[PDB]
Design a protein around this ligand. Sequence first.
Ligand SMILES: [Zn+2]
Length: 136
Amino acid sequence: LNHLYMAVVADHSKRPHHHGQLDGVEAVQLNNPTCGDVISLTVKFDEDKIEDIAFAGNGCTISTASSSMMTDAVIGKSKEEALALADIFSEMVQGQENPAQKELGEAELLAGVAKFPQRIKCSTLAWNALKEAIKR
Ligand SMILES: [Zn+2]
């Protein structure tokens, strides 16, 4: 029942979702905890919502997985909705319990990074590139 989790996290790191870059969209680039992760996160908004999203970069398994899962979780949400999820994720990876972590989708599998301090920032990188993208 747990072996499936490894396959889901592995799939997000090896075959990222919403990977690459969107056309005609000024990307948002941030980088490392210290680990050496980087991401270019192009985000499209048609309304206040997120029409589409895409990312590219280089990181550890944790950081790539987390970027990939972040895209799934936020696609078609809202400056504020997306930003609330970011807060939810960020709090989850500091050991907080919250039923709302369900709204994170497969990113919920990264609850375990709260036990690895150096990994916190690996996992949040994508979320913070999102925060910046929304806030333009
Ligand atoms: Zn990392």
